[PDB]
C-alpha cells in the first residue's frame, strides 16, 4: 500500500530531458508530413498536367495515365522491396510491435524508403492513405533523435517512439486529439504497463499540428457544413447501421488479410514480379483515376459529395464495390500506404447509402442522408482496426458536427460489438501477430 | 514473451457478454440516479428562492430566511455524512480512485442513500459544489451494487463496472459522453500498473446514462456560448502565456484547498455536532450570498455564458474570481458532499475572460474576442489542479462546441500542465487520496 502513496505523490513527473526532445520530434514529424503531403500533391499535379497536353486521342491519355502511375508505383514497390521490407503496407503494426520491443526501428532505412516510396504509390493515384507513411516515418523520426542524442531508459525510448507516431497521425488529418487517443487505445501495449508520458505526447502532437497549420491553414481537408441534429426516436436507426458495419468489418479483415496471400503467389516473393505486379495495380488506379476518379485515390474527394447526397443510390453501390476492390488490391499488395483513410471513404459511401433508404422509408423523422455518412465515416475503423474511441474523435475533428455525437457513438459501438461476436480481430494487432509468428517459424 | 504476445494479440478485445450487458444496466441506473439528483437539487433551489418572494418586503427577514433554509439543508447534508458515511465527504472521486487500486471499500449500502440526500441538501442549498462528486461516486457504487447482487466475479468484471458507473456518472453530470470515458482512462484507472478495464463496456454504460439524460434534459444545454470567432496563428502565443498563469495558480490552489481542509478541521476537531453546525454557517453564508450576489454562490454554470460574452466588467471579474475562490474553498474543504470540479470551470472561465479583456486593449491588431480566452481557460484550472488535461479539453469541447479553438485549448492546457509540474504541484485528486490512504495507516 505504501508503494502507492509514494507513487501518487510522484505522479505525472516526466523528466525535462524527455519533454523537450518530444518537441523536436513533433517538429520534424510535422515538417516531414508536410513535405510528404506536398510531394504527392505535386506528383498528382504533374500526372494531371500531361493529360491536358495530350487531351486529344482518347487511348493516348489513358495510356500515359497508366505508365506515369505504373512507373511511379514500381518506383515505390522497388524502393521498399530492396532497402526496407518492413516499410511495406501501413507500418502501424510495425510501430506497434516496436513499442512491445518485438520489432526493430531501422530509421536510417525506413525514413528514406517510406517517404519516397510513399511518394511513388500515393502520387500514382493509388488507393492508400498518408497515415501509414506519416505514422511509421514519425516513429522512426522520434527514434532517430533518440539514438542521436543518446537518451537512456525504458521511458525515453517508448515515449519518443509514441510521440513520433502520434504527431504523424495528427499532421495527416490536422487532428491533434485523434493522434494522442490513438496511442493510448491502439499503439501502446494493450496488455502490459509501459512508461509512456502522455504529457510528452501532447507537446509532440501540438508542434506537428502547428507545422501543419503553418502550410495548410484556411483550407480544410473535409468540409461538410453543419448537418441536421439527431432526435432520440432516430437513434435506433444508427444502432442498425452499426450492426451492419459490425458484421462487414471482420469480412473486410478476411479479405485484406487473404488478398495479401493471393497476391503473394503472383510473385512468390520475387522482387521483379512483385514490382511488375505493382505497376499493373499502380497503373490501374491511375487509369481509373481518369475514367472514374471516385473509384481511385484517397477517397477524401467524394466524402463531401457523398455526404451531401449528390451521388445516386446506384452510383454509391458502384463506388463502394469498386473502391473495395481497389482498396484491397493496393494495400494488400504490400504497397507503402495507409488503409486507414480509404476505410473512411468506404463507410461514408455505405452510410449515405443507408441514409437514402432511411429518408424514403421514414419521412416523418425528417432525415438528412448526410448524418448517416458522418456516423458511418469511422464505422469501418471501429470494426477493422478496433479502436472506436480514436475513430469517433478523429471523425469529430474533421467533420465538426458534435451535434451527432450520440449517433456516432451508437453506430460505432453497435459495430464494435458485432465485430467481436462475429469473431473479428484488430486488423493492426492481427497483422502484427502474423509477422511475429512468421518470424519464429 | 513474443509467443505470449501473439496469443494475446489474436485474443484482443474479447470482453465477455456478461459484463457488456451489466455495464449497460449500470449506465442505465447511474443515469436515472443522476437525473433524479439533478432534479432534486434544482427543486430545492427553486423553493428557497420562492421563499425570498414570500418575504420580499422585510429585507432583514429576507436575509434571514435565505440563511436558515440553506443552513438546515446544509446541516442535513453534513449530518447524513458524518454519521452514516464519512467516506461520502468531500468530492468522492478520490474514494473511487482508491477503490480501483483496491485500497478502499465501496460501501454502496451506505454512500448511495447518504451521498444522494446529503449532497441534495448542500447542492440544493446553494453551496459552491458540483454534481460531479455525487454522480461519480454514486455511479461507482451503483456499478458496485449490481456487481454484488448478480455475484459477478473477476478482476475484469470488478474494476470495469466500477469504472462504467464512474464514467456514466460524470457523463450524466455534463451531458458529455466522451469526457466520462476519457476521465476513466486518464485519471480514474490505476496509473502505475495494468488494469482489466473493458473500455468497450465503459462505452456502453456511458451511452445509456447519457441517453437517460437526453430523455429528461432536452432542448436546453447546460452551457450555451455560441459560435465564437477563430484563432489566428499569431494569436497562439497569448494562450501559452494564459496557460503559464494557470500552471502556477493551480498548485497554489491545491495548497489552499488542502490547507483549508486542515484549518477548518480545528473548529470541530472531528466532533460531529460542531462540524454539522459549521456546515450550517457556510451553507447559510452561501444561501445568503445566493441572493445579494449570485455570482459568489451556486455552481457557476450561469455566469459562464455571461462572462464569455463579455457582459461583465473587468472590475466585476476580479470581484467574482476572488469571492468564488473564498466561497469554493470554504464550501468544499469543509467536507460537504459535493465536488470542486464544476466550480473550477467557473473560476477558470472568469480568470480566462479577464485575461482576454487585457489582451484585447494591448493587441487590437489581432481583432480578439475575450470569449476565446474564456473558453481556452475554462477547463484550465482542472489542467493545473487535477492534471487531467485530455479530459478537460474534450469536456470543454463538448459543452462549448468550439473546435476551432482546439489549438488554444490544448496549448493553454499544455503550459498549464507543464507549469503544474515545474512548480511542484500535485494532482489534486491523488494528493487527497494519498492523505486518506496514509491517515488510514497513520492511526495504527
Ligand atoms: Cl501492415
Ligand atoms: Cl493504415
Ligand atoms: Cl474528497
Ligand atoms: Cl470534484
Curated annotation (Swiss-Prot), chain A:
Effect on the protein upon substituting residue 186 to A/G/Q/S/T: Abolishes proton transport, and reduces chloride transport
GO molecular function list: chloride:proton antiporter activity; identical protein binding; voltage-gated chloride channel activity
Short sequence motif Selectivity filter part_3: positions: 338-342
Transmembrane segments: 16-52, 60-83, 107-124, 131-149, 198-215, 236-264, 271-292, 313-332, 338-359, 405-421
UniProt short sequence motif Selectivity filter part_2, positions renumbered to this chain: 129-133
Subunit text: Homodimer.
Protein name, as recorded: H(+)/Cl(-) exchange transporter ClcA
Species: Escherichia coli (strain K12)
